[PDB]
């Protein structure tokens, strides 16, 4: 097992990967789409041009990272790149409490670094036009319905990371792909309701970003904190409850 | 294996996840479209902005949903999520009769659930612009034809569980992913057929939640009932009389 | 287990049935939904119309996933070939016994007609007279020689894939079905707008016979999906053992 | 292991496939989408009718077809198929340095031939409206940006080749999908900002025809040498430091 610095710096590596593709897809879908006809308030851009296919194709950015850092990166530090699941996986003592913290930090130094590098990579336009893909709730959706959301959102998360990855009786290899292919899934059904976030430090990244381009979001942030967490500890909780 | 009480709550908590996501992602479609040229009677709004790409989109959100929860519940309940399988498995002596109504009911209850909180997540707009995402024919299909589409479409679901699920010869940890994968490959031909529900739970959820909104739907239901089944019953017991 | 031949012809019915049933289902969905929208020029002829390129990669998903589960459910019955053109390749080989070749393409082809008039049946006559019934045929500025060509050169790369996931003893088990469906599903997405990516002669036959039923008479085309196929599928059965020995 | 002679034909036929079905797609997507409405600059056509899902539609022409290389031809050649990764792995000591050269003059042959072969399938359109798929910089993205955004890209896959390829502990099979899958990911999101070539020969094999057929672009080919090298050279060695 590598030392903890190691692990630390493979989970830098990892959400830098995961915010800077992830919501980087976001960002290029608004900007290419900026200017066609959205025919209600509801749609911002995203599905504009290729309806509901862009939010597939969004999500399916975020899968196949999401699968690919696992991959690489699983056997070096876990591949936690969430918090939610750091936090989730310490609740059931899964994960050494010493180590929650180190882990959560290394999470966000490395979401605002993919954030920021895809905003130089592309020009201001990355967050004024494409927001750096941050989330936030949308056309007619409360505080209360957008953290519900965001849980039952990351409770079907955590549930295939209990049931494939955690669990000794999981078939060795699928986890990748299927955690990935999962969140593509969610996104795709909760993207225009929450921006489908899952994840504390991939919301950072970009309300860091944006903040920075002037563009400040942070009354949005508990959403995308207590929603995910209460989501994934929920679901770490009953798995262990119903598979014993 | 887990006490029959765990396999119900099992079964609620994955019908609810494939009534959330699946048809959840058909209502965020027409509700994201709403206002766009549908450019003839048979285009409904989904397919409006993304044409048949908006359908693959909506296919996957299933799949992916349905892979999730077999890697994530299958080894509890076995995972069926819908009670043709069910009866259909039953039909074969894979299935204990006296756990076949049992089932049933954990589905029918886990898709009100899924379809109620999904309702509550995003307003009223899921129903009366979304419809719930409940599933009835299309323009200029009559009920003859949309329960033979709907068998023929449980027909090839039901062959893909027999052939990497059931059969002791399934290459292992294929099952969800292909299972998933195979359903959303159905949905995108089917779709604008009859709303592809292969599905009594399925079908079920919306048509209370819509029924409780005002969209009183029954008429169509046993569309969903006979066209699932007969199809189910008939792929399982073809497949053991091919493969002995 | 190793079943009758009356088994594999009765399992190769059942398996071109849901490949031509879904797979070219799709092409007619795409395009009776997209009937009216603005064609923005004669190469787009309504697939791409509201989905562009994302309209064929769902095409192309549609029939991908389709035959990935065929062959997980029917594979370990009858081979799964759903294709005169892989059995060709297959039988070039010695692979596959010449004595059942035969019984294998009629199995094909009674199952593709059978899935082409039962989605026809489902839908109404808009699926051809608007459809097509998704027979393949050239596309705006696509002469038979580059026809054959694309069809060979797509087909090509398809049974190399089932020579080197499927035939081939250190193939890695149970990846099969979901790597040669995707393949196939790839070769879609960029041929379909030149040819209508068939790749396989059962499959291009059962929507003809359903047109040419619901008068719209396409065998002119037929070749092309006859000899683009195999040449591409026996050159590359050939290529991958030449490769791969000795 | 099989001859040198065989695995340089084995690299050809694998680089010929990567270049005629991956930008192929691109070319197909602009062909079909010629004369719709642009509603901006940084749209070019991909885009237009199918939103990011025509990015997706592309990466995933380009993911299938490599998955489906690896699967067939990997076991003879390596199915390197881009000489950044044969350069990424002889800088490891994983490759050997005679072979370098070779192998690279074996994806160029191989990449133009695709190149040249799709552009006779389809006709003068192919290029004059296609561009045969050449990559190049997006409105807004000078060659400082560009060279980054490609190195940021290759760099995500040659860490995924490392994970699921080189390492001795990479769960077996998965390779040529996830592989594939992940460069899929990349396209979708790095696509309209540099093309998202990743590899010289997929660069070169358009840029041959193109210059060929009248459009000469080699002023854009360094950002497509440096940028993948110095992106996989990079991602190879911080591999090796992590895991060791
Ligand atoms: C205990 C409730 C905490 C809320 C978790 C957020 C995700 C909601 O998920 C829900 O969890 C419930 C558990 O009570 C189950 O009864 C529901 O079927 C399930 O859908
Ligand atoms: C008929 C009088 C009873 C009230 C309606 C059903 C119970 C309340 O339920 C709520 O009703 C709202 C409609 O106003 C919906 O928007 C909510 O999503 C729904 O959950
Ligand atoms: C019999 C179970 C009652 C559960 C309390 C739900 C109260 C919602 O209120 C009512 O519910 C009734 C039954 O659905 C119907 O009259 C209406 O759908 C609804 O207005
Ligand atoms: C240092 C001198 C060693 C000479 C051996 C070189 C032959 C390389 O061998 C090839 O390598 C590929 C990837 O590198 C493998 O995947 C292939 O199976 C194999 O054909
Ligand atoms: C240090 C001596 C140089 C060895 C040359 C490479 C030999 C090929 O080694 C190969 O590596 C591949 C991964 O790329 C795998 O596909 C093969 O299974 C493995 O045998």
């Not at 999470?107 to 967050?127: D, R, Y």
Request: some cysteine; proline content about 6%; hydrophobic content about 55%.
């Amino acid at each position: 097992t590598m030392t903890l610095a190691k692990r630390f710096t493979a989970e830098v590596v990892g959400t830098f990967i995961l915010v800077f593709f992830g919501p980087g897809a976001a960002v290029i879908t608004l900007m290419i789409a900026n200017g066609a006809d959205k025919p209600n308030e509801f749609n911002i851009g995203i599905g504009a041009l290729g309806g509901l296919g862009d939010w597939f194709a969004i999500g399916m950015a975020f899968a196949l990272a999401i699968a690919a850092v696992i991959y690489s990166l699983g056997r070096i530090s876990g591949a936690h790149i969430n918090p939610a699941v750091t936090i989730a996986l310490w609740s059931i003592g899964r994960f050494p409490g010493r180590e929650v913290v180190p882990y959560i930090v290394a999470q966000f130094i490395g979401a605002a670094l993919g954030s920021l590098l895809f905003l130089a990579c592309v020009g201001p336009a990355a967050a004024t036009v494409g927001g750096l893909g941050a989330t936030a709730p949308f056309p007619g959706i409360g505080y209360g319905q957008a953290i519900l959301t965001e849980a039952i959102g990351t409770f079907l998360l955590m549930l295939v990371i209990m049931g494939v990855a955690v669990d000794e009786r999981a078939p060795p290899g699928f986890a990748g792909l299927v955690i990935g292919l999962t969140v593509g899934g969610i996104i795709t059904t909760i993207g225009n309701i929450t921006g489908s976030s899952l994840n504390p430090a991939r919301t950072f990244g970009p309300y860091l970003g944006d903040s920075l381009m002037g563009i400040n979001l942070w009354q949005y942030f508990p959403i995308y904190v207590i929603g995910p967490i209460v989501g994934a500890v929920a679901a770490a909780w009953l798995y262990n409850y119903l598979a014993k």
